[PDB]
């Protein structure tokens, strides 16, 4: 699905995530793509919190 892949790309491009958060998010997305949106908002909220 183009939708799910787009979400995956958005999360992947977040600059302040580490390799572990990166994988955890992407892998959860693959596991249950119906959680894509929530996973992205979670990832975005996290990425901003971990800014320098």
């Amino acid at each position: 699905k183009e939708m799910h892949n787009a979400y995956a790309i958005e999360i992947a491009l977040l600059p302040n995530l580490n390799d572990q958060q990166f994988h955890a998010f992407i892998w959860s997305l693959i596991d249950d793509p119906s959680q894509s949106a929530n996973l992205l908002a979670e990832a975005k909220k996290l990425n901003d919190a971990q800014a320098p």
């Binding site: 892949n5 995956a8 390799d19 990166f22 994988h23 693959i30």
Partner: protein, 95 residues
Amino acid sequence: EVVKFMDVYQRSYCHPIETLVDIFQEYPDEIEYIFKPSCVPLMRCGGCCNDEGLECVPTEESNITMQIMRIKPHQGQHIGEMSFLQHNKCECRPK
């Protein structure tokens, strides 16, 4: 078509994958023999971990048995059962 990022990521991530292995490589002590076939299909750890602090290792292993033609050149040949090591589970772990 173009392979989507999420599909590349999933398919390339550490897991057991069918890999063709030299029998000589698995039976180093029998290179007097000639085998047909010379390689066998074995489930093995492969792929990436995308974390420099981690590596793809087998965490569960089993054996599998195959019918192989064991040829002693000019002095015999016979079908024998041969055992090989297989990877059932692969995980990304610290080195």
